[PDB]
C-alpha cells in the first residue's frame, strides 16, 4: 500500500496504513468502514461519503464496486436479498489492459518538477510535443495524464464511453479492428477494443483520454518513474489485466482537472516533422564543457561535423550514442577520477550530452542529475522531443543553436498548443543555425582571495547557467560558499529563478526565460557574488548517519560480473574494483576496507545518482584515494551499493540505476519512498548537504535482515542532529598537518600515470 486514507469521523477497523504489504496468503480484508446515522437514510448517505473519502492505493481494492452498491437504487429502496449481488450490474468507469505493449506508462506534463537538486527526475513524456498534442486534440487540460507507448502499444477494452487520440510516431491503430486516424478525436463506445500496434516511424506515441487517467500523485505529479517504483499506475509499466480508471464527471469523485476545450483534430501545420529515414538534425546549445580547457579544438569540430549512431542501450534514463572518440585537453581528471572526462561532480542539464568516459549519452527525462563526467552540449528544451523518437541505428547530427533561437522554438510550441491554430509551429531550418559552435564560457571572475575563488559561468542548456567555483579542485569552503550564493538569491528572492542545484564545487541554476533572460541572470549572479560575506570559521547544522555496510557482498560483486559479461570484460579497474583502488593507491585491499569503516563522509550534494543518492567526501584528507569512474558506465547497479569515484563516495539509493563509481560494498538505501522509515526525516531523501555518513561492518546476511526491517520501518537508523564547525575542523587539520602533507606528497607518480593512460583506452 502506497497511500492510505480513511474518513476520521467514521469508525474504521483496519490493520493497514501507508507502507503495509498486503499478501494473498490469508484473507484479503483491508478495512471495515463503519458508519452511524440517525436512521437508515442518514446512514446510507454517510456510508457513501465515507466510501468517497476512502483512498487506498498500491493494491487493487473493491472500493469502486462498494461505491456503486452503496449508491444503487436497489440498496436505498432496500430491495436487498441474499441473491441480489450475484446479478448486480457493475460497470467500472475505466479501461482494461487486454495486452500491455512493450513499455506503456502513465505520464503527465511537465512531470515531476521541483526536485532536480535532489535527483528526482521530471519523468513525464519522452517526446513532450506529441504528448501535448495528443492531450489537446481531445480537449484535456494540459495537466491531464496520458499513456506513453514505446515501440509497440497495448490493446485496451473500454468499459465506459469517452474520446481518444493518438499522436507521435507512426503506428497502426485499431478500433474494433477498423483503422483509426492519428491526431483526431476518436469517439469510443464501451465494449470497444482500442489497439495500437508497432511504431513504424519514430520510437514513441501517445494515447490520450478525455478527462485524463485517474491515478494518485506522488511528489506533485502522476508521472511514472519506473526505476524508483514511483508514480503512474503503481510505480510501473502496464501489465496484462490492469484496470485504469477515468474521470467521467457524472460517475466520478475525482481530483483530476476537467477538460478545457472541445475535442478537435490537430491542425496539420502544428504536427511535428519526424525524420523519414532514420536520420535527424538535433539543435543544441553549446556547453557547459565544449571548450578547450577540456576537449581539443578539432574534437569539438568533429563533435558537430560527424554523425552519431544510436546505441541499443538506450531508454528513458538516456540515449547512448556511437561515434568519434574524444581527444582530451587534460591527461587525467585528478582527484575526481583519472579518466580525462572525469569531473568534480556537478549537476547536469536535462538534454546534456554526457561523456561517460569516451562515449556520450543524452540525458533524458528519467535521467541522472548529480554526475561525475563532463558534458559537451545540451539539446535545446524544445528539441528534446526528437531524442524521444530515436531508435537504435538512427543517425543524428548536433546542430549549434543560440540561446535566443532556442527560446523561439520553445515559445512556438507553447503558442501552438495554447491556441491550436495553423502556422504557429517553428522548426529547425538553416537560417536558425549558428555558423560554428560558440564558446560556452559566459564569463570568468578572477580569484580575489582564499575564500573568494575564481568563478566560471557556463551556458548549460536553454534553461540553465552552471556556476563553477575555483580551479578544478575540492575545497570545503567553496561548499559553504555555494550555500551562501543560494542564500543571496533567496534574500534577494530573484524573479525568474526556478531551482538551484548543489554540486561539489558548483551549482546549477535553472531559469524561466519568459521571466528573466540569460544575460540578465548572468549579471545578477555576477553581482550577488560580491555580496557573499563569510569567514573561515563558519558552521552548519549537520546530521550524522551511522549506516551498516556489507563489504563486497554478492550483489555488489554480481554488479561488476554483469558489467564484465555485458559491456566491457576487462579494463584497468576490472575484474575487481576494490583491487583497482588498492593497486593504484599502493595499499592492501583491506586498507581500503579500513578507510570505509573509519572515514567521515561529508555529503556535498544529492542525486549522485538518483533519489537523493549522495556525493560525499572523506573529511580526513588521508582517506582520499585515487581512482576513476567507469569507461563506459554500467547500465545497472543494485540498490544500496556503495561506490568510490575518484575520491568521492556514493550510495546508489535506487534499484537498477546506471552507475560509474567503483563498487565496494552495500548499505541500505538513503531514500525512503513512503517516508515510513524509523528516522526523524520528513521527506524521502534522508540526507542533506553537510550531513555526515559513517559506515559500520555487518555480514551480508545481517544486512539482508536490516534491509527487510528497514523497508517496513522496523529498523532504527542511527541519526544524531549536530553541528559541523569549520573552525574546529581547521584546528583538527593542524593537529595532523604533518601526517596529511606526507600522505599528499606521496600519492601519485609513474604508476598512477600508467593507469591513467590505460584507463583512457
Amino acid at each position: 500500500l502506497t497511500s492510505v486514507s480513511f474518513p476520521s469521523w467514521a469508525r474504521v477497523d483496519t490493520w493497514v496504513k501507508k507502507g503495509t504489504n498486503v499478501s494473498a496468503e490469508y484473507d484479503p480484508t483491508l478495512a471495515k468502514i463503519i458508519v452511524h446515522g440517525k436512521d437508515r437514510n442518514d446512514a446510507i448517505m454517510k456510508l457513501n461519503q465515507a466510501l468517497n473519502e476512502t483512498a487506498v492505493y498500491g493494491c487493487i481494492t473493491n472500493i469502486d464496486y462498494l461505491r456503486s452498491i452503496a449508491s444503487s437504487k436497489m440498496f436505498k429502496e432496500a430491495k436487498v436479498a441474499t441473491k441480489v449481488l450475484d446479478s448486480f450490474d457493475y460497470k467500472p468507469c475505466a479501461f482494461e489492459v487486454l495486452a500491455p505493449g512493450a513499455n506503456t506508462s502513465v505520464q503527465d506534463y511537465p512531470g515531476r518538477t521541483g526536485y532536480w537538486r535532489i535527483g528526482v527526475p521530471p519523468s513525464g513524456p519522452m517526446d513532450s510535443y506529441s504528448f501535448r498534442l495528443a492531450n489537446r486534440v481531445v480537449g484535456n487540460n494540459s495537466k491531464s495524464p496520458a499513456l506513453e507507448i514505446t515501440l509497440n502499444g497495448p490493446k485496451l477494452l473500454f468499459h465506459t464511453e469517452t474520446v481518444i487520440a493518438v499522436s507521435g510516431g507512426t503506428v497502426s491503430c485499431t478500433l474494433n479492428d477498423a483503422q483509426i486516424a492519428q491526431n483526431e478525436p476518436i469517439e469510443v463506445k464501451r465494449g470497444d477494443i482500442l489497439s495500437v500496434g508497432k511504431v513504424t516511424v519514430g520510437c514513441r506515441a501517445y494515447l490520450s483520454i478525455r478527462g485524463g487517467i485517474d491515478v494518485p500523485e506522488y511528489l506533485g505529479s502522476r508521472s511514472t518513474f519506473a526505476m524508483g517504483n514511483m508514480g503512474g499506475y503503481n510505480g510501473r509499466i502496464l501489465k496484462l489485466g490492469d484496470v485504469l480508471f477515468l474521470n467521467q464527471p457524472e460517475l466520478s469523485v475525482s481530483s483530476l482537472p476537467a477538460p478545457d476545450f472541445e475535442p478537435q483534430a490537430a491542425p496539420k501545420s502544428l504536427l511535428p516533422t519526424l525524420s523519414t529515414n532514420k536520420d535527424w538534425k538535433i539543435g543544441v546549445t553549446c556547453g557547459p564543457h565544449g571548450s578547450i580547457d577540456l576537449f581539443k579544438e578539432e574534437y569539438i569540430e568533429q563533435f558537430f561535423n560527424d554523425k552519431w549512431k544510436v546505441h541499443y542501450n538506450s531508454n528513458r534514463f538516456g540515449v547512448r550514442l556511437i561515434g568519434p572518440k574524444p581527444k582530451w585537453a587534460r591527461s587525467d581528471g585528478g582527484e575526481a577520477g583519472l579518466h580525462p572526462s572525469n569531473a568534480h561532480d556537478y549537476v547536469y542539464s536535462l538534454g546534456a550530452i554526457n561523456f561517460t568516459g569516451d562515449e556520450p549519452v543524452i540525458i533524458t527525462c528519467d535521467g541522472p542529475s548529480l554526475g561525475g563526467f563532463v558534458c559537451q552540449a545540451v539539446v535545446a528544451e524544445a528539441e528534446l522531443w526528437k531524442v524521444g523518437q530515436l531508435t537504435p541505428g538512427d543517425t543524428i547530427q548536433f546542430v549549434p543553436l543560440s540561446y535566443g533561437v532556442a527560446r523561439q522554438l520553445k515559445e512556438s510550441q507553447d503558442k501552438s498548443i495554447d491556441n491550436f491554430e495553423e502556422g504557429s509551429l517553428l522548426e529547425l531550418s538553416d537560417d536558425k543555425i549558428l555558423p560554428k559552435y560558440e564558446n560556452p564560457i559566459l564569463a570568468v571572475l578572477p580569484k580575489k582571495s582564499d575564500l573568494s575563488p575564481k568563478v566560471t559561468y557556463r551556458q548549460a542548456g536553454d534553461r540553465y547557467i552552471l556556476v563553477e567555483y575555483g580551479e578544478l579542485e575540492f575545497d570545503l569552503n567553496i561548499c559553504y560558499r555555494i550555500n551562501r550564493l543560494i542564500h543571496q538569491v533567496e534574500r534577494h528572492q530573484t524573479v525568474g529563478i526556478v531551482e538551484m542545484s548543489q554540486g561539489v564545487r558548483s551549482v546549477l541554476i535553472e531559469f524561466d526565460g519568459s521571466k528573466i533572460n540569460q544575460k540578465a541572470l548572468l549579471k545578477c549572479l555576477i553581482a550577488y557574488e560580491s555580496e557573499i560575506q563569510f569567514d573561515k570559521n563558519w558552521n552548519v547544522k549537520s546530521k550524522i548517519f551511522k549506516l551498516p555496510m556489507a563489504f563486497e557482498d554478492s550483489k555488489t560483486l554480481d554488479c561488476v560480473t554483469r558489467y564484465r559479461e555485458t559491456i566491457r570484460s576487462e579494463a584497468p579497474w576490472l575484474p575487481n574494483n576494490v583491487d583497482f583502488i588498492a593497486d593504484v593507491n599502493d595499499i592492501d585491499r583491506n586498507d581500503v576496507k579500513n578507510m570505509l569503516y573509519s572515514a567521515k563522509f561529508m555529503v556535498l550534494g544529492l542525486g549522485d545518482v538518483f533519489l537523493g543518492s549522495p556525493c560525499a567526501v572523506p573529511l580526513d584528507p588521508r582517506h582520499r584515494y585515487l581512482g576513476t569512474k567507469y569507461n563506459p558506465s554500467r547500465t545497472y547497479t543494485a540498490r544500496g551499493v556503495v561506490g568510490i569515484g575518484g575520491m568521492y563516495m556514493c550510495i546508489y539509493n535506487a534499484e537498477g540505476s546506471p552507475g560509474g563509481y567503483q563498487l565496494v560494498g552495500r548499505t541500505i538505501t538513503a531514500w525512503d519512498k513512503l517516508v515510513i522509515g524509523d528516522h526523524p526525516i520528513d521527506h524521502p531523501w534522508l540526507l542533506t548537504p553537510f550531513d555526515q555518513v559513517e559506515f559500520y561492518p555487518v555480514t551480508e546476511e545481517e544486512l539482508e535482515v536490516i534491509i527487510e526491517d528497514n523497508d517496513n520501518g522496523k529498523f532504527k537508523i542511527d541519526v544524531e542532529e549536530s553541528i559541523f564547525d569549520h573552525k574546529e575542523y581547521l584546528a583538527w587539520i593542524n593537529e595532523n598537518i604533518d601526517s596529511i602533507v606526507a600522505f599528499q606528497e606521496a600519492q601519485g607518480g609513474e604508476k598512477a600515470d600508467e593507469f591513467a593512460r590505460l584507463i583512457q583506452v
Binding site: 477497523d13 496468503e25 490469508y26
Partner: protein, 238 residues
C-alpha cells in the same frame, strides 16, 4: 463548579494563571447542574440558573484570577462553556462558569442537581477480568481486540506468522510470539504452537476472534485442560 475544582483534572489551569484560592461558597437556590455528554477523557458540568421554583444550591470554589492573566485563562475555555456571572448564597454576584443552552440540551446530559455539587457526582460513579490475554488471531480483529484490551489495562499478546511479522497487531501488542512458518496451517491453526505461546507469555486467557481456531472444539478443550481460559463457548456447544 467543574473540572477546575481542587483535585479534578483541569485544576492545573488555575495554577497556570496564578490564581489564588479564596473560599468555597454555594450558589443561591436558583441553580441546576448538568453533567455534559462525556467526549474527552474529561467529564464537564454545566450550571443553569432558573426562574424558579426549582433551583437548588450548588457548591463552588472561588478564586482570584489576576486581571493580567484572565485572558490566558479564558483561552482554555471551550464551547459550550463560558464565563458569566453567578449569585452566591450571600447575594454577592461573582464571575463564574456558565453554559450555553445548547450545552445541556444534548443527548446524554444528566441532571445532576440532586448531588448538590460536581465532586459528589464523580464519586457516585467511582473489575479486571484478566491480567494478560493472548489473541489467537491476526489482521483487523486482532487490532480491534487489542484496543479494548489496552483501554481495559489488560496486557495483550500477539502471535504472528512470518509474513505477518510486520503487521499492526504485532506492533500494537505489549508482547508477541513468533510462530514460525507461512501458511495458515503452519502457524495460526497449529494448536500446539498457540498454547505454547500463551504458556511462554503467562497469558491467563485466549481470545480467538473469528476464523482459525475460533469454532474449533478440540482447541476450546485444550485451553480448558491446560488452565487457560478460552474466551468463547465450551468445546461441547461448538
Amino acid at each position: 463548579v467543574g473540572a477546575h475544582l481542587k483535585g479534578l483534572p483541569l485544576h492545573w489551569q488555575l495554577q497556570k494563571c496564578n490564581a489564588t484560592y479564596l473560599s468555597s461558597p454555594k450558589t443561591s437556590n436558583n441553580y441546576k447542574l448538568y453533567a455534559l455528554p462525556k467526549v474527552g477523557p474529561v467529564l464537564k458540568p454545566g450550571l443553569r440558573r432558573v426562574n424558579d421554583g426549582t433551583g437548588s444550591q450548588i457548591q463552588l470554589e472561588v478564586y482570584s484570577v489576576p486581571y493580567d492573566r484572565f485572558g490566558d485563562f479564558i483561552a482554555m475555555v471551550p464551547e459550550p462553556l463560558g464565563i458569566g456571572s453567578v449569585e452566591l448564597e450571600s447575594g454577592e454576584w461573582v464571575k463564574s462558569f456558565i453554559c450555553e443552552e445548547f450545552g445541556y440540551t444534548q443527548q446524554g446530559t444528566v441532571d445532576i442537581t440532586k448531588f448538590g455539587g460536581f465532586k459528589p457526582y464523580i464519586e457516585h460513579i467511582q473489575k479486571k477480568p484478566f491480567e494478560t490475554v493472548l489473541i489467537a488471531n491476526r489482521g483487523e480483529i486482532a487490532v480491534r481486540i487489542m484496543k479494548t484490551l489496552k483501554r481495559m489495562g489488560i496486557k495483550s499478546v500477539a502471535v504472528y506468522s512470518d509474513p505477518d511479522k510486520y503487521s499492526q497487531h504485532v506492533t500494537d501488542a505489549d508482547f508477541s510470539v513468533a510462530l514460525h512458518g507461512r501458511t495458515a496451517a503452519e502457524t495460526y491453526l497449529d494448536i500446539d504452537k498457540i498454547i505454547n505461546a500463551a504458556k511462554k507469555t503467562g497469558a491467563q486467557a485466549i481470545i480467538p476472534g473469528y476464523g482459525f481456531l475460533s469454532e474449533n472444539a478440540d482447541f476450546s478443550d485444550r485451553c480448558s485442560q491446560e488452565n487457560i481460559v478460552f474466551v468463547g463457548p465450551s468445546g461441547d456447544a461448538i
